[PDB]
Design a protein around this ligand. Sequence first.
Ligand SMILES: Cc1n[nH]c2ncnc(N)c12
Ligand SMILES: [Cl-]
Length: 146
Amino acid sequence: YFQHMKHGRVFIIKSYSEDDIHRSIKYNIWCSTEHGNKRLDAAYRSMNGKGPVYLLFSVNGSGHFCGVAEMKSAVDYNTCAGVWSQDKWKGRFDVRWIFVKDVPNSQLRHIRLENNENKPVTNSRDTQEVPLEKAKQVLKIIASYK
Ligand SMILES: Cc1n[nH]c2ncnc(N)c12
Ligand SMILES: [Cl-]
């Protein structure tokens, strides 16, 4: 249960590669775009441990979110090249996967993001930030979905 969360920031991850998500679950690491890496680094560092950064993962075109992971370190920008599905993916940070489970978009699309033109949360791009009150609604639904 994620209702205890008073602080904390939540981002959507949209992957072109399901293989990269499988690698991320296996080794508890992730990376993002050049902009996404800077956005997440800033958010993690500004938290100063006062609350979590959660990542809500979804494979482009799958019609479902596939789980949730907590960001667990700052971004190292200079790391081994070519570990992901494509060479463009640079950098690395630790994550801890909290839920690994498929949740259909139909369960989530009523939740709209006031910072993204009131678009459904299921129509977000990679690294879209989610307002906390809408993030808690998404997390409650992922956690109790069966
Ligand atoms: C890897 C990775 N990090 N962030 C991403 N976003 C879209 N596609 C991907 N393969 C990735
Ligand atoms: Cl590495």
